[PDB]
Amino acid sequence: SSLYNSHKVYITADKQKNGIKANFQIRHNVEDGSVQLADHYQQNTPIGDGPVLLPDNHYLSTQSVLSKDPNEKRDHMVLLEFVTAAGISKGEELFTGVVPILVELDGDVNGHKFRVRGEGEGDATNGKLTLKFICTTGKLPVPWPTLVTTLVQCFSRYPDHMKQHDFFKSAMPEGYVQERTIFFKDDGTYKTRAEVKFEGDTLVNRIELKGIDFKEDGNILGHKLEYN
Secondary structure: OOOOOOEEEEEEEEOOOOEEEEEEEEEEEEOOOOEEEEEEEEEEEEOOOOOOOOOOOEEEEEEEEEEOOOOOOOOEEEEEEEEEEEOOOOOOOOOOOOEEEEEEEEEEEOOEEEEEEEEEEEEOOOOEEEEEEEOOOOOOOOOHHHHOOOOOHHHOEOOHHHHHHOHHHHOOOOOEEEEEEEEEOOOOEEEEEEEEEEEOOEEEEEEEEEEEOOOOOOOOOOOOEOOO
16 A cells, blocks of 8 residues: 555557557455456557557556445445656547546456446546446446456546647547456456447447456455455
8 A cells, every 4th residue: 555556557559550559567455465466458449540649658647546425325336537648639629628428348257247337527638537337237246446447548638748649539539449458367367348439429438348267266256355
């Protein structure tokens, strides 16, 4: 536990697929005080074919807050994110105000199938967003914390001198495809495909997620994380 807790998402351009790839590690605290590594490998490809801002090597800086809603009785997660870029087109046009967000997730983990819906709003200029997530099929079979990365980087606050490295906004509203492989040390793997685009003016992240080789007693299937 540190007080100022930034996770850095390292972004390198992929001239190859006209997109970007990314690499970072996530850490989850376990109840017994140890730590679960979760290695992320990410691929992002534009959906249209229009001009999109390929960038130079920078990183995103992310802080997450996870809370509950004392009223709400379903299995849920309230989340605030605070993202801003660092290291030194105009899809950026709609990211001027407070934008509505819908997030839909279809997921299979070792056969345990589930969905998650989420709504809220983001504010790219302040690099902030709020979202309430409900598990619309009941209990979540994995810990909420492990889904956070999978559950809209277009909302990062890009400083003025980096404004041309905002691939995410550039490729809007045709949007982009986000794919991650996520390796949990000594346990299973997630694969994710997601499409992020505008449907109306609300912003939508629709996701499929498959979860392979988990230990039905490991930290994930065993809900052994600090946020419980």
